[PDB]
Each structure stands twice: as structure tokens, then as C-alpha cells.
RNA sequence: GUGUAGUGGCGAGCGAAAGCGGAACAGGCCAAACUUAUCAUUAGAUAGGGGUUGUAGGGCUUGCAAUGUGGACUUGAAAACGAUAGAAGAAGCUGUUGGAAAGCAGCGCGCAAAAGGGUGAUAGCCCCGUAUUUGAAAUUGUUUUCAUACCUAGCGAGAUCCCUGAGUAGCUCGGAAAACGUUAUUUUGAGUGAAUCUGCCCAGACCAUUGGGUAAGCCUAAAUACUAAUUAGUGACCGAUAGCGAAACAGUACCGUGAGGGAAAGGUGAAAAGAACCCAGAGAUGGGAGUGAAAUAGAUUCUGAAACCAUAUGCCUACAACGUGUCAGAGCACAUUAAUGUGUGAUGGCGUGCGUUUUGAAGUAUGAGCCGGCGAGUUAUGAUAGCAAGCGUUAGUUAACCAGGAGAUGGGGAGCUGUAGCGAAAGCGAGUUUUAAAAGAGCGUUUGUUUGUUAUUAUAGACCCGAAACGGGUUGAGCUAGUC
RNA sequence: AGGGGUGAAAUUCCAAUCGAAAUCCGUGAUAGCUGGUUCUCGUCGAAAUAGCUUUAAGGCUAGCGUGAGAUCACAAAUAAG
RNA sequence: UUGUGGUAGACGAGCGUUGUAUUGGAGUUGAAGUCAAAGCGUGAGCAUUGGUGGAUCCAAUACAAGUGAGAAUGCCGGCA
RNA sequence: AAAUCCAGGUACGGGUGAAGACACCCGUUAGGCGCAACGGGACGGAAAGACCCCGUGAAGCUUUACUGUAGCUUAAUAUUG
């Protein structure tokens, strides 16, 4: 039984090409290049799925410090007044967007002083 | 069975392939080398060769051929530890052929061998017997009529 | 396959493996070796487990 | 499956994809279970017992 | 038998002969003595009878009894079975989607014929057919019967009667087929060169004994190998980059002065029904109309995707250091295989390809222009090891071969491993070799068999592709070198 | 007429090719030397050392991974003496 | 509870294509291929739907493989 | 019309890196796209480096290297008295 084997190649190439959509140049038409592009794209996605959970935390800290420098005290001092005294495991993104609800974060700000 | 539910139990094992897939588990150079000599076509040089060092089958001395150009005289052996299981008496060439012990047409002397005890009396007709085998046969009221 | 006759004259089979062989150093220059040496090497011998595979399929 | 090899039976059954006539020695293990329905001769029982 | 005996710089390797079991099976014919006739009867030559040799035979002198067994075989008469042309040869309508029914639904019909092909879709009953029964003017083949021509036959007795294959065989000098690399065996290029049944040769140097056979003459059917041809059939063989290089006016077109090397491409539509005629244009052609179910089936003619190149909706870009993607992200225009939805991505963070070879890759080493198709672990015979299966305490097991549907299987036990091993061997034996040793040491102290399958390995090119090469056979002096 | 021809000799020429033509066959010559060796997934997981080698870019044996089985404690490692 | 980086490499478990053996099914009310679509798995992959098309395919179990393409300064065919 | 071509929207200084960067790090400069020139770089294009070295490679040539051998020469022998 001589085997022709045509469907597999077409379906594999179409599936690989469909993944890389909205790509510059011919990189969305050539399967041989499309596979490399999607390889690199998924590697970047893998590294960014941790890079973003780190960068969001960085912006988290930055926007907390932005609000806390206005009260005349240090961000590290605020974390301290959370941890050792008036034990609080309060969420950082919580207290961040409690800037959006006005003055409600100020309750936590004034509560750390026993 | 039916012709729609034939089933095995433990056959149909894995089929290794030396030229399918970069990461199938077996690579492009599966089995043979990583550009070494064995990896190349017609590798795995003759089994007796040992790299250039003198072969083992030559470093050793040569055995003897005391009887030059002859075959050892073959015999048909009747061990006394197994004849007792075979249910037949007066064991003689006129009666071996019936029990399919020996080939129907074959000319060959019969050798009698054994030390294990025997209970039922037997009457051997052979060409030669071991001394203690003969003693054991005659201990149990047996008789051996030693032929020529 | 054909078994190399050059080796069938230098090995002897025994029950349950244990290929038998003769030691070398027996046909030359006796005085260079002690009489005790020839006394040891007169006996037979067997190969180790190292070269068993290269001898098995070859014989 | 027939032991006598009757001509009257074998004259018919030759234009149907479902029926065919064979001797006892001729049928194999495969065909014997491909039938889904068996019609055996009364004679073949003794020979089958003899051959086990 | 057997990878046995053996042969090998005892290396790669090489590999019998008996015997056994099968296929088929059958032995005959000349010279020689003896004799007849003829040859300038000197013939040594020509032509007739006689015998075909080992349980030695034949010729000679002399008896008995055949009238037949038979085919490597001459012709005549017939017969059967084929072969080369043909014939007969069963069975249906109705509705349905439908361009068309044969498919689909309801009730029927025949098969010694339900192989196959065609018919506006997959038809047993529409057509050719097919199983079976038949048919040969003429030619031809095989076999059968009878008659006929040539060749052929058993058992005795005597007898130191005669004959029984000449440059023959051995021997020497060099080789060669033999499994042997030269050793009896065989064969011969150079020489040497006997006997006559009281013989000669043979049984791996040779002699003797023993046993076996009659060379130096000739002939032979079947059983074995192959298929370019004809007939019929088959295919877990291929389907236009496949299949023989040749599905088409292929060894053609072409490349060569010649040996030779050697291409590519098939498919409208059921039926040409191949587009009357009109408009534009000179025309090709296109748009129409018309046939057609379909003209997006239109002569470029089945299906029509990729690199490619154009046009278009929505969005974005002209302060931008850019492997161009990824994670968040406003705005914009739409609404889906309803899915925390889709396209686009102004902006921020991060961000030096894919393979191969490598101490080491983004490389200033390499491999790819893209796209589509092809493009390498198999097969035969054996070994090893796992797994699984059947059989099992005298186990197990078939090969070739015969039987059939080109089937498993039936018969076919020839052999194979296991049952005892040890020893170089003679031989011995649960022991055996070493030895004075029964002391010790090595080995042994019954522990399967046949397959399926898997992995490795052995000989075959044995994963794929890649050389300068070697040898043998052909074609070239029209270019050129020389000569005439 | 090609392990040959010719050669006022240069390794010139012998059909643009000549340290020995073109072509066909043995021929699928061999190649320890390049490059390639196409389906995925689950578990474990090195070496670039020693010896030998007409061997040094190779191969063989040992160690190093892995599959099956045994030893489970008298065997192996960790801390202490 | 102990773990799950990974080439050379051992080893286990699976998919896909072609054909065949049966058992069921779809098909001029429209198969395959192919175009595109905002589906479902751990993967080779497997669905659904509309247009193109007018004759073959699909499901479950087995068996046999000219069998799964990214490269070989590839080769054919077309095209920047 | 061609060689080439991994996909490209392709900057510079200092440094870094398989050791001389269009992309890497830090700074600097720069509207998108043509056209005519001019060749510095992209270790540029074209030759699987001719050189060296390796291969248990090829070919040719050489001699008091090996084994042979055509031819030449001597001897026994048949042709042979």
C-alpha cells in the first residue's frame, strides 16, 4: 500500500498559520516562518506570565507610595505599622483601589496609630 | 470470538523507529551514535574485531584434534533414573522400536547408565553396562544378559 | 550465520555456560618464567563475565 | 458442513452470498465462526469426536 | 545431514561427501577373438552374421526348451479429448425526490446463470452477457485400440583352447576441478612408458590381507531452469512527480558526427446539444440572446487551495532606534460556533530567529528565496534476550513432498533441541581429567519444547545521498599533431 | 587508437575537456570523512576518564544512565566517638 | 507522603493515513477535497456550520505497512 | 535579463559578547519616500580553499624499496641421425 499522505500536511500547516494572526510582513503566510514566530511568541508569553505578575506588584508599590508620601510618612513605615503593631494582612491592591473610593483608605491610615 | 472483538493479552509491543520525529522519544540518530563510527552506514564492525588490538580468538592457544578427521562414536543412552518411569519390561531392541524410544531404523550400540535404586525386576539386553550400574541392577533381583 | 572456525578450535562448551579455554605462555622461553609459573598455567581456565557477549554469539 | 458431499445440495446455493457448501476437512476455524448459523450433518458428529 | 569433517598470512572467510527422507525411474548399442564374400586377394580395406561383459563375461565343440516379454521404436486404419470461428441461454412494474432513477419506498418474479461491463445517480429481472447445454467445412495437438517393419529371451556339458577398449595407466617436471591454498581422486602441457582372470583398478602416503568394481568405446526419455509469444484469470500491486524511461502517433522531441544520453504533458458536458443571431471592435474576443439541470461545464475545457499580484469595507502610521512579537492599555467601527466576545493597537514593561556542528551561538562559521508534491530503518535467511501462547513426564516437533480455492489444514517423524556429563582422545560414567592418590582443584549432581511478537546483532548495497578511482568492451584523425 | 596514437618535446594535442579521452558495463565500487534522517506524550538520566590499539577526528573492555530480577541489613551513606 | 529542568539515551503509554476482514450507518434531501468561521482535548489531533462539487465515504474492533517533512549548496513544477 | 536571498520597518559613539555588532548594554543623533552619484561595511556576490594538516584516500613518476613480469640470455630435453 503506497501512501500519499496529503491531509496531514495541509491541516498541520493551516493550524500553525492560524495561530499567528495579525503578523507583520509575510510572517502570517509562510508556515515555515509562522512556526518560528509562534514559537518565539509563546516563549515571550511564558516569560511575561511572570514578568507581569512582578511588574503589576511594582506598580502596586509605586502607587501606594504615591498616596502615602502625601501624609508625611514613609511607605516602609506603613508596612511596618501593618505588620508588627496592629497586625494587618490587608491586601495591597485592595488599599490601592481604596484610593478610588475617596477617603476610605484614610481610615486604615489613621487606624494604624493605636 | 467474533470478527469484531478479537483481543490479545500482552503481545503487540512497542515498535521503535530510527527515522521518525525530532522529539518522538527516538531522535534523528536513534540507536546508532552521535556522529561516531557506529552511527554511520554499515557500522558495528565484525564481532571478533577489538579495535586493532590482537583478537581474543588469536591470543589464546589452539585446542587438540587427537582423532584427526573422525566423528565420536555415538551411543544411545538408557539412564536408570528414567527407565523406571517408562512402563515396559524385557527392554530389548525388538521392543524399543514399539515404544518410540529410539528411531525405527537405526543401527547403534546401547549404553546402560545409572546409580539410582530400582524396585521392579528388569531384564536389560545391551552391549555395555557400568560396573556399579550392573551391581545395582543385580541387587533388585534383576538380570542383565550382556550381549556382544 | 557461519561460526568462525578459527575460534571453534580454541573454545569448548560446558553445561550452563562457563566457556573453557587454555592459558597462553606455554610454548616459548621456559627459563624466563619460574617452574611455579608453568605449574599454574598448565591448568585450564574460563573467561570472565566481561568478554562473554563477544564470545557467545560468535560461537 | 457435510460429510457425504451430496450433489443435490451443491447444485444449488451457488448464486447466494450467504450460503456455501463445504466438506468437514475443508472448513477452517475462521469460516466455522463466520457463519452466525450452523447446519451440521448427523454423520459428522462421530468424525468430529474421533478427531476431537 | 551441517555451518559437521575439514581447509585457510589456521585471518577475513570457505564448505563438502556418505547416509537418510522425497521428485521421477528403464537401460541399451559397437571393436575383439570365430566366420563368410570381395578387394593388382600380399589389403592392413569394404560389406554381412556374434557378443556386450564381473552373480566375470564372450567366442569355440556339442544339447534341451522358446515362438514369446517389449519399448529411447517405421508406418496404415480407426476412436476419444482438446485448440483455432459461433448458437441457445430466467426473471417488473408502481409512486417518489428529481435535468434524467437503476438509487428510495409497496407488492412481486428466477437462478446449474447474485462473475463483469454499459445504459442522463449505486439496475439480479433495461442491454450485452455470464453457469450449463451445444457447434467444426478445413487445419492441428495429445492420448487410446488393431494390424504392420527393425531390434530383442531361458537352462546344460567340455576346456591350463582363444578374446575382453595402446601413447592407454602409472612415474617425473609445472599446473588446474576438487570444501583442500596440490594429497590419494580427476584432468594434462614436456618426457618416460605394462599386464591379460594366476589380470587390472579401488577403499586420502604405502605394503600385505580382506572385500568391491571391470576404465582407457558409443547412445539415452521423464524428474530440473527459464517466459520475449498466444489464451483465460488473479492481485490487502500503482494511479499522471505514481506505474516499465513510453496512459497522448516514446526511445519520439531534443543533446551530440558517433558509442550513447535521453524529455514533458490524460479528464467539458448525459448527448456538441461546440453557441443561430445582435451590440462594440478590423479581428482575435467580450457582453448578450439560445441549447443545456448547470455556461463559475465555453473549448484555457473534473475537483481549483500556495508562494504571487491586484481592488475594496473598518482601523492605524509620517519624532521613529524596530528579530517587529508578547503582557497591560485608551480610542475607533462592528456583533459571534454567547463566548469574562471580534477586528484594529495610539501608549508603557519586556524582548539578539530556526536547524546542524560544537568547550561553546544572533553570529563577522555554517544550511535553506518562498511555495506544493516526492524524498531513509524495511525485507530474506539464522542467533541471542524479554513477553505471550499451545503441548508436558519418555516430552515437544515437522522440513522437503503429496492432496485443494494458488487456503488453514490432512498425511509425510527425514531430522532438531531436551533427557549425562567429563575428558585433547582412547574411554569412563553421577562421575569425570590431573595425578601414585579414591587427597585437592575445574566441570557435573535432570531441569523443557514448538511458535507469535518485540529489541539487538550476523550475510546480503542492509539508514539516504556524495568522490578523486580501477578493470573490461566500444566510438572517434571532419578539431588538432604527424605522414602519404 | 587510448595502461595507446602523434609529439622541431610545452605534460602539446588526440573533437572546447588529457599526469592520460568520451561512452557503457562490473556499479547501488568503497569511504573510520560531510550533510539529512519527517507523529506526539509520560518517567529516569551521563561522559568528554583508565588500559590497549599502523591508534590519536576511530574502535574494543572497564566506570558512568537505563529496563527486568535478587540482596532489606551482616550491604551502602549520613551526623558522632 | 515523596517528587515531575533536560539533550546523547533506555523505556512505557497513544494519535493519524492507506488497504483488507467482518459486524452497523450516511449519501442527487448532496460524500470527499478545498475556502473561511469568534469550537473541543495534555498532544499527534478531533468536531460543527455556509459557499464551491456531483460520486463515494463514516463509525467500533483487528491485521499489513512504498506511512506522518524545515533544512540534505536538494530534484521536479510554478511564482516573487 | 543574474548571481544572491532565515524572516526584516535595516543609524552612530563608548563598552560588552565565539575575542572587530544594523539589533545586546548605556548614551547620542535622526520627518515618510524618491532620484543622480560614490564605493567603506554588511568578515559583500560568485569557487563544499587550490595552501597546510587529517584520511590507514586517489593518480602520476622514480631507484641498488618489496614481490613479480614482458623481453633478452644460458643449460637439460623432444624435434635427432
CSV table of N, CA and C (backbone and C1' of nucleotides) in Angstrom, one decimal, chain H residues 12-46:
chain,number,residue,atom,x,y,z
H,12,C,P,25.7,52.2,12.1
H,12,C,O5',26.3,53.4,13.0
H,12,C,C5',26.8,54.6,12.4
H,12,C,C4',27.1,55.7,13.4
H,12,C,C3',28.0,55.2,14.6
H,12,C,O3',29.4,55.2,14.3
H,12,C,C1',26.1,56.5,15.3
H,13,G,P,30.3,54.2,15.1
H,13,G,O5',30.6,54.9,16.5
H,13,G,C5',31.3,56.1,16.6
H,13,G,C4',31.4,56.7,18.0
H,13,G,C3',31.8,55.7,19.0
H,13,G,O3',33.2,55.6,19.1
H,13,G,C1',29.8,56.8,19.7
H,14,G,P,34.0,54.2,19.5
H,14,G,O5',33.7,54.0,21.0
H,14,G,C5',34.3,54.9,22.0
H,14,G,C4',33.8,54.6,23.4
H,14,G,C3',33.8,53.1,23.8
H,14,G,O3',35.1,52.7,24.2
H,14,G,C1',31.7,54.0,24.2
H,15,G,P,35.7,51.3,23.7
H,15,G,O5',34.9,50.2,24.5
H,15,G,C5',35.0,50.2,26.0
H,15,G,C4',33.8,49.5,26.6
H,15,G,C3',33.6,48.1,26.4
H,15,G,O3',34.4,47.3,27.3
H,15,G,C1',31.6,49.2,26.1
H,16,U,P,34.9,45.8,26.9
H,16,U,O5',33.6,44.9,26.9
H,16,U,C5',32.9,44.7,28.0
H,16,U,C4',31.6,43.9,27.7
H,16,U,C3',31.8,42.7,26.9
H,16,U,O3',32.1,41.5,27.6
H,16,U,C1',30.0,44.0,26.0
H,17,G,P,33.3,40.6,27.1
H,17,G,O5',32.5,39.5,26.2
H,17,G,C5',31.4,38.8,26.7
H,17,G,C4',30.5,38.4,25.6
H,17,G,C3',31.1,37.7,24.4
H,17,G,O3',31.3,36.3,24.7
H,17,G,C1',29.8,39.4,23.7
H,18,A,P,32.8,35.7,24.9
H,18,A,O5',33.4,35.4,23.4
H,18,A,C5',33.1,34.1,22.8
H,18,A,C4',33.5,34.1,21.4
H,18,A,C3',32.6,35.0,20.4
H,18,A,O3',33.3,35.6,19.4
H,18,A,C1',32.6,32.7,19.7
H,19,A,P,33.3,37.1,19.2
H,19,A,O5',34.2,37.7,20.4
H,19,A,C5',34.5,39.1,20.6
H,19,A,C4',36.0,39.3,20.5
H,19,A,C3',36.7,38.9,19.2
H,19,A,O3',37.7,39.8,18.9
H,19,A,C1',37.6,37.7,21.1
H,20,G,P,37.7,40.6,17.6
H,20,G,O5',36.3,41.2,17.5
H,20,G,C5',35.8,42.3,18.3
H,20,G,C4',35.4,43.5,17.4
H,20,G,C3',34.3,43.2,16.5
H,20,G,O3',33.5,44.4,16.4
H,20,G,C1',36.2,43.8,15.2
H,21,A,P,32.1,44.6,17.2
H,21,A,O5',31.1,45.2,16.1
H,21,A,C5',30.8,44.5,14.9
H,21,A,C4',29.3,44.3,14.7
H,21,A,C3',28.5,45.7,14.7
H,21,A,O3',27.4,45.5,13.8
H,21,A,C1',27.7,44.3,16.4
H,22,C,P,27.4,46.3,12.4
H,22,C,O5',25.9,46.9,12.4
H,22,C,C5',25.4,47.9,13.3
H,22,C,C4',23.9,48.0,13.3
H,22,C,C3',23.2,46.9,14.0
H,22,C,O3',23.1,47.2,15.4
H,22,C,C1',22.2,47.4,11.9
H,23,A,P,23.8,46.3,16.5
H,23,A,O5',22.7,46.0,17.6
H,23,A,C5',21.8,47.1,18.0
H,23,A,C4',20.3,46.7,17.9
H,23,A,C3',20.0,45.5,18.8
H,23,A,O3',18.6,45.6,19.2
H,23,A,C1',19.6,44.9,16.5
H,24,C,P,18.2,45.3,20.7
H,24,C,O5',19.6,44.6,21.3
H,24,C,C5',19.7,43.3,21.7
H,24,C,C4',20.7,43.1,22.8
H,24,C,C3',20.9,44.2,23.7
H,24,C,O3',19.9,44.4,24.7
H,24,C,C1',23.0,43.3,23.1
H,25,C,P,19.4,45.8,25.2
H,25,C,O5',20.5,46.4,26.1
H,25,C,C5',20.8,45.7,27.4
H,25,C,C4',22.0,46.4,28.1
H,25,C,C3',21.9,47.9,28.1
H,25,C,O3',21.0,48.4,29.2
H,25,C,C1',24.0,47.3,27.4
H,26,C,P,20.1,49.7,28.9
H,26,C,O5',21.2,50.9,29.0
H,26,C,C5',21.9,51.2,30.1
H,26,C,C4',22.9,52.3,29.9
H,26,C,C3',22.4,53.6,29.2
H,26,C,O3',21.8,54.4,30.1
H,26,C,C1',24.4,52.9,28.2
H,27,G,P,20.9,55.7,29.6
H,27,G,O5',22.0,56.8,29.3
H,27,G,C5',21.7,57.9,28.4
H,27,G,C4',22.9,58.3,27.6
H,27,G,C3',22.6,59.1,26.3
H,27,G,O3',22.4,60.5,26.6
H,27,G,C1',24.1,57.4,25.8
H,28,U,P,21.4,61.3,25.7
H,28,U,O5',22.1,61.4,24.3
H,28,U,C5',23.3,62.2,24.1
H,28,U,C4',23.8,62.1,22.7
H,28,U,C3',22.8,62.4,21.6
H,28,U,O3',22.7,63.8,21.4
H,28,U,C1',23.9,60.4,21.0
H,29,U,P,21.3,64.5,21.0
H,29,U,O5',21.1,64.2,19.4
H,29,U,C5',22.1,64.7,18.5
H,29,U,C4',22.0,63.9,17.2
H,29,U,C3',20.7,63.9,16.5
H,29,U,O3',20.5,65.1,15.7
H,29,U,C1',21.5,61.7,16.6
H,30,A,P,19.1,65.8,15.6
H,30,A,O5',18.3,64.9,14.6
H,30,A,C5',18.7,64.8,13.2
H,30,A,C4',18.1,63.6,12.5
H,30,A,C3',16.6,63.4,12.5
H,30,A,O3',16.0,64.1,11.4
H,30,A,C1',17.6,61.4,13.2
H,31,G,P,14.7,64.9,11.6
H,31,G,O5',13.6,63.8,11.8
H,31,G,C5',13.3,62.9,10.7
H,31,G,C4',11.8,62.7,10.5
H,31,G,C3',11.4,61.8,9.3
H,31,G,O3',11.4,60.5,9.7
H,31,G,C1',10.1,63.8,9.3
H,32,G,P,12.0,59.4,8.7
H,32,G,O5',10.8,59.0,7.7
H,32,G,C5',9.8,58.1,8.1
H,32,G,C4',8.8,57.9,7.0
H,32,G,C3',9.4,57.5,5.6
H,32,G,O3',9.6,56.1,5.6
H,32,G,C1',7.9,59.3,5.3
H,33,C,P,10.9,55.5,4.8
H,33,C,O5',10.7,55.9,3.3
H,33,C,C5',9.6,55.4,2.6
H,33,C,C4',9.4,56.0,1.2
H,33,C,C3',10.6,56.0,0.3
H,33,C,O3',10.7,54.8,-0.4
H,33,C,C1',9.7,58.2,0.4
H,34,G,P,12.2,54.3,-0.8
H,34,G,O5',12.4,54.9,-2.3
H,34,G,C5',13.1,56.1,-2.5
H,34,G,C4',12.5,56.9,-3.6
H,34,G,C3',13.3,57.2,-4.8
H,34,G,O3',13.3,56.1,-5.8
H,34,G,C1',12.4,59.2,-4.1
H,35,C,P,14.7,55.5,-6.3
H,35,C,O5',15.3,56.7,-7.2
H,35,C,C5',14.7,57.2,-8.4
H,35,C,C4',15.4,58.4,-8.9
H,35,C,C3',16.9,58.3,-9.1
H,35,C,O3',17.2,57.6,-10.3
H,35,C,C1',16.4,60.3,-7.9
H,36,A,P,18.6,56.9,-10.4
H,36,A,O5',19.7,58.0,-10.5
H,36,A,C5',19.7,59.0,-11.6
H,36,A,C4',20.9,59.9,-11.4
H,36,A,C3',22.2,59.3,-11.1
H,36,A,O3',22.9,58.8,-12.3
H,36,A,C1',21.8,61.2,-9.7
H,37,A,P,24.0,57.7,-12.2
H,37,A,O5',25.3,58.6,-11.9
H,37,A,C5',26.4,58.0,-11.1
H,37,A,C4',26.9,59.0,-10.1
H,37,A,C3',27.9,58.5,-9.1
H,37,A,O3',29.2,58.6,-9.7
H,37,A,C1',26.3,59.8,-8.0
H,38,C,P,30.2,57.3,-9.6
H,38,C,O5',31.5,57.9,-8.8
H,38,C,C5',31.3,58.9,-7.8
H,38,C,C4',31.6,58.3,-6.5
H,38,C,C3',31.9,56.8,-6.5
H,38,C,O3',33.2,56.5,-6.9
H,38,C,C1',30.5,57.3,-4.7
H,39,G,P,33.7,55.0,-7.2
H,39,G,O5',34.6,54.6,-6.0
H,39,G,C5',34.6,53.3,-5.4
H,39,G,C4',34.3,53.3,-4.0
H,39,G,C3',34.4,51.9,-3.3
H,39,G,O3',34.8,52.1,-1.9
H,39,G,C1',32.2,52.7,-3.1
H,40,G,P,36.3,52.5,-1.6
H,40,G,O5',36.5,52.1,-0.1
H,40,G,C5',35.9,50.9,0.5
H,40,G,C4',35.6,51.0,1.9
H,40,G,C3',34.8,49.9,2.5
H,40,G,O3',35.6,48.8,2.9
H,40,G,C1',33.9,52.0,3.2
H,41,G,P,35.1,47.3,2.6
H,41,G,O5',34.0,47.1,3.7
H,41,G,C5',34.3,47.1,5.1
H,41,G,C4',33.1,47.0,6.0
H,41,G,C3',32.1,45.9,5.7
H,41,G,O3',32.5,44.7,6.3
H,41,G,C1',30.9,47.9,5.8
H,42,A,P,32.3,43.3,5.6
H,42,A,O5',30.7,43.0,5.8
H,42,A,C5',30.1,42.9,7.1
H,42,A,C4',28.6,42.9,7.1
H,42,A,C3',28.0,41.9,6.2
H,42,A,O3',27.8,40.7,6.9
H,42,A,C1',27.0,44.0,5.7
H,43,C,P,28.5,39.3,6.4
H,43,C,O5',30.0,39.5,6.9
H,43,C,C5',31.0,38.6,6.5
H,43,C,C4',32.4,39.2,6.4
H,43,C,C3',33.4,38.4,5.7
H,43,C,O3',33.3,38.4,4.2
H,43,C,C1',34.4,39.4,7.6
H,44,G,P,32.3,37.4,3.5
H,44,G,O5',31.0,38.3,3.3
H,44,G,C5',31.1,39.7,3.0
H,44,G,C4',30.0,40.2,2.1
H,44,G,C3',29.8,39.4,0.9
H,44,G,O3',28.9,38.2,1.1
H,44,G,C1',30.0,41.6,0.3
H,45,G,P,29.3,36.8,0.4
H,45,G,O5',28.8,36.9,-1.1
H,45,G,C5',27.4,37.1,-1.4
H,45,G,C4',27.2,37.0,-2.9
H,45,G,C3',27.9,36.0,-3.6
H,45,G,O3',27.2,34.7,-3.6
H,45,G,C1',28.3,38.0,-4.7
H,46,A,P,28.0,33.4,-3.1
H,46,A,O5',28.5,32.7,-4.5
H,46,A,C5',27.7,32.7,-5.7
H,46,A,C4',28.5,32.9,-6.9
H,46,A,C3',29.7,31.9,-7.0
H,46,A,O3',29.4,30.7,-7.6
H,46,A,C1',30.4,34.2,-7.4
